[PDB]
From a paper:
8-Oxoguanine (GO) is a major purine oxidation product in DNA. The major way to remove GO is the base excision repair pathway, usually initiated by a GO-DNA glycosylase. While no enzymes with an A/G specific-DNA glycosylase or a dGOTPase activity have been discovered in these species, a GO-DNA glycosylase called [name] (for Archaeal GO-DNA Glycosylase) has been initially identified in the hyperthermophilic archaeon Pyrobaculum aerophilum. Despite very low sequence identity, [name] is structurally similar to eukaryotic and prokaryotic OGG1 and OGG2 GO-DNA glycosylases and, like these two proteins, belongs to the Endo III structural superfamily partly defined by the central helix-hairpin-helix (HhH) element followed by a glycine/proline-rich region and an aspartate (GPD).
The residues involved in GO-moiety recognition are conserved among the [name] proteins studied so far, and we confirmed by soaking crystals in crystallization buffer containing 8-oxoguanosine (8-oxodG, Pab-[name] + 8-oxodG) that the Pab-[name] binding pocket has the same conformation as the one previously observed for Pae-[name]. The damaged base is sandwiched between two aromatic residues (F146 and W212) and makes H-bonds with six Pab-[name] residues (Q24, W62, K149, P172, D174, D208). The sugar moiety of 8-oxodG interacts through its O3’ with the carbonyl group of S51 while the O5’ establishes an intra-residual H-bond with the N2 atom of the base. Unlike Pae-[name], Pab-[name] shows a change of backbone conformation at the catalytic K142 residue upon GO binding. The torsional angle Ψ of K142 has a value of 128.8° in the apo structure and of –42.9° when complexed to GO, leading to a substantial conformational change of the HhH hairpin. This conformational change could be induced and/or stabilized by the presence in the protein active site of sodium citrate coming from the crystallization buffer.
Numbering used by the authors: -2 to 239
Write the structure that this text describes.
């Protein structure tokens, strides 16, 4: 329950969350691949846009992020809106609600155009400001699952581009997708936002890093590449959440 999961999340720590992000999560592997075949500014813009349309997918989120990375590798992208207008109808894994998704990309296009490499650096040092900027450009509540998720994925892309790590702000709540919501119901009747913020504050692990611990495992990622000390902690968590 809450007490035991906060203890184990605390023992895993931001250190353990970062290991999972940078070594286990296939989505980071996909981003690393894309980073080697498109310029850094476009890479970061594309990752934010892709996050904001990563919902009502088909198949598995990890397959979608690999499709995105393999598609944009080596492409000459100008308008991100026009790139998604050509990409999404030809997608295997993102075929529903395409006009809705495209209108979201149209709305954030001006904001994305401000992401020079200098500005990307500044935002990685102040991800709370990025969080509000994305929400305001979209015209939505910042608590929205895809908005907080886009901040997480910005942090994946930015650490690759900038060769530095900054932790996600404690105040950014967990992205409430089907994996997180279904797990939360097994554990509690509390709404996931309050539940995981309490665990975050008790453990010292910000909610977006808690997401990195939980979400790959809930999709079936293997923990067997983790070093023994970490792997033993991940196994205790799996027995809790499974
Ligand atoms: N919580 C969460 N959601 C994800 C991840 N990857 C991904 O594609 N999603 C989708 C699910 C959902 O539609 C959106 C917000 O959670 O992001 C991910 O890593 N974590």
């Amino acid at each position: 329950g809450s007490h035991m999961i906060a203890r184990i999340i605390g023992e895993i720590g931001i250190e353990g969350a970062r290991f999972i992000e940078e070594n286990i999560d296939e989505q980071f592997k996909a981003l690393r691949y894309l980073s080697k075949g498109i310029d850094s500014e476009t890479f970061v813009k594309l990752v934010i846009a892709n996050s904001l349309v990563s919902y009502q997918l088909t198949g598995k989120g990890e397959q979608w992020w690999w499709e995105f990375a393999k598609y944009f590798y080596g492409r000459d992208v100008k308008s991100i809106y026009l790139a998604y207008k050509e990409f999404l109808p030809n997608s295997r894994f993102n075929r529903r609600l395409i006009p809705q998704k495209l209108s979201r990309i149209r709305r954030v296009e001006t904001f994305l155009s401000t992401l020079t490499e200098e500005r990307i650096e500044e935002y990685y040092g102040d991800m709370s400001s990025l969080w509000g900027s994305i929400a305001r450009a979209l015209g939505v509540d910042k608590e929205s699952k895809t908005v907080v998720f886009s901040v997480k994925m910005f942090g994946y892309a930015a650490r690759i581009v900038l060769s530095t790590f900054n932790p996600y702000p404690m105040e950014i709540p967990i992205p409430e997708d089907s994996r997180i919501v279904k797990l939360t119901k097994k554990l509690t009747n509390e709404k996931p936002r309050k539940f995981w913020m309490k665990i975050a504050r008790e453990s010292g692990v910000p909610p977006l890093h808690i997401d990195s611990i939980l979400w790959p495992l809930l999709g079936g990622a293997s923990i067997d590449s983790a070093p023994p000390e970490l792997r033993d902690k991940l196994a205790e968590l799996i027995k809790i959440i499974r």
